Ligand binder design. Structure first.
Ligand code: CA
Ligand code: CA
Length: 460
RNA sequence: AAA
């Protein structure tokens, strides 16, 4: 059992517990291929090792070995054939691959290669290489493999910064991880911009990195400093590196600023290069949604003639792109929610309902998203299905998720409005009286609350 | 990646 025990001491994708789910694997593979072709980074060893790991999980071990050989080839060709500790991730993945393929003599050869380097560098462990480069590699792998891994990713980069606070690579990874984690909390009450200072430091330490700049721009826009942010958008757009990724986030920036036509032009250029990106399809749908809202206001809700044709084009285009996003990544919860809401605009309540039913079964990484799912389904029930019974059920389910948020407050207000309406048509509805007491209790008005709870009690 |  020495071989398997030794393999478990290696630091590589096989021991990083990435937990890649089958239903997210097609999208992951597409994003890995996009990154190989279009993200300009100093080292590409990590991304080719992740592609090999994906190929292995797909049952394509010979294809996996080709990616590991490419990782080794690129490491030398583009860095003066110098030795680099990042090779140990590749060798570790070779050892695991050969073990799984039954090429056990070769697996042992790769264990021996790793051991030889750990000894040469006075590493305390025989096989587990302790160095900042491999902490970074672990972090980048976690960061590519879905939101459930982001706290672990951030901690990988933080471990480096606790020893070397000006390390450029880990500054970048820590800032991106922190930014995405801030996004998970962006609608929660009293959320704070933990990623802002990290992003400023990462831009300082990585002055040519346009990916970091556009995230800094977006966080500045979040914090009410759009003009400052726009300077970073312009700097990133002036450099050719990673252009297709810069376009995604610049487009978000311009959409949120109100320059939707400009956003769409950038996204359509980006789609020429990465047509499988679910982020691009979702962002494109969001632009069409924003244009729909614009047309509705200019025509005060009653577009006719060419305006009606334009509106229908926006609705059907948003549906097309939201459907494209969820075909490619069926776990993309918020894209299903935007899709359901757009089927309401199209007048197809059966397809809206179908997508809401799908959403009610999901288990998002961000648990608060289920507040939005119940809230919007409750609104659909109240306003499209004319079912106060089901509206109340789902407003209550949103409220039961206790985390204070924009949506939980809207759900309380919507429930209040609904029950006040029912009491106007029937002042002695006992269920409505106690729900109104509940609402007032959640708001803090304890005397009004107990009044309605008592009033409700008497009648019974 | 909605918000
Ligand atoms: Ca390039
Ligand atoms: Ca290749």
């Amino acid at each position: 059992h020495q071989v398997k025990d030794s393999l478990e001491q290696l630091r590589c994708h096989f021991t990083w517990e990435l937990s890649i789910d089958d239903d997210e694997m097609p999208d992951l593979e597409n994003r890995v291929l996009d990154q190989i072709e279009f993200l300009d980074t100093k080292y590409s060893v990590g991304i080719h090792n992740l592609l090999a790991y994906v190929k292995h999980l797909k049952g394509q071990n010979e294809e996996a070995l080709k990616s590991l050989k490419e990782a080794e080839n690129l490491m030398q060709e583009e860095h003066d054939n110098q030795a680099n500790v990042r090779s140990l991730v590749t060798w570790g993945n070779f050892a695991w691959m050969y073990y799984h393929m039954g090429r056990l003599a070769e697996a042992q050869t790769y264990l021996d290669k790793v051991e030889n380097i750990c000894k040469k560098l006075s590493n305390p462990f025989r096989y587990r290489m302790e160095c900042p480069e491999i902490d970074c590699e672990e972090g980048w792998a976690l960061l590519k493999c879905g939101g459930k891994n982001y706290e672990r990713a951030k901690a990988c980069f933080e471990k480096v910064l606790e020893v070397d606070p000006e390390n450029p690579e880990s500054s970048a990874g820590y800032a991106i991880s922190a930014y995405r984690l801030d996004g998970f909390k962006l609608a929660t009450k009293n959320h704070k911009p933990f990623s802002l200072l990290p992003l400023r430091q990462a831009v300082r330490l990585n002055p040519d990195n346009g990916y970091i700049k556009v995230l800094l721009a977006l966080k500045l826009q979040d914090e009410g400093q759009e003009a400052e942010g726009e300077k970073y958008i312009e700097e990133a757009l002036a450099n050719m590196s990673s252009q297709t990724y810069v376009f995604r986030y610049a487009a978000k920036f311009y959409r949120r600023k109100g320059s939707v036509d400009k956003a769409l032009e950038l996204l359509k250029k980006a789609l020429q290069e990465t047509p499988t990106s679910v982020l691009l399809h979702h962002q494109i749908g969001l632009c069409y949604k924003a244009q729909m809202i614009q047309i509705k206001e200019a025509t005060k809700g009653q577009p006719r003639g060419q305006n009606r044709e334009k509106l229908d084009k926006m609705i059907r285009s948003a549906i097309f792109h939201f459907e494209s996003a969820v075909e490619k990544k069926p776990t993309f919860e918020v894209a299903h929610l935007d899709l359901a809401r757009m089927y309401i605009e199209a007048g197809n309540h059966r397809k809206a309902e179908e997508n809401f039913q799908k959403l009610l079964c999901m288990k998002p990484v961000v648990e608060e998203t289920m507040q939005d799912i119940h809230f919007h389904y409750g609104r659909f029930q109240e306003f499209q299905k004319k079912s106060d019974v089901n509206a109340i059920i789902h407003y209550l389910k949103a409220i039961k998720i206790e985390q204070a948020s924009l949506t939980r407050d809207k759900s309380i207000n919507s429930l209040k409005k609904l029950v006040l309406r029912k009491l106007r048509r029937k002042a002695l509805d006992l269920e409505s009286l106690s729900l109104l007491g509940f609402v007032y209790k959640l708001e803090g008005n304890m005397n009004e609350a107990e009044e309605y709870y008592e009033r409700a009690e008497r009648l019974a």
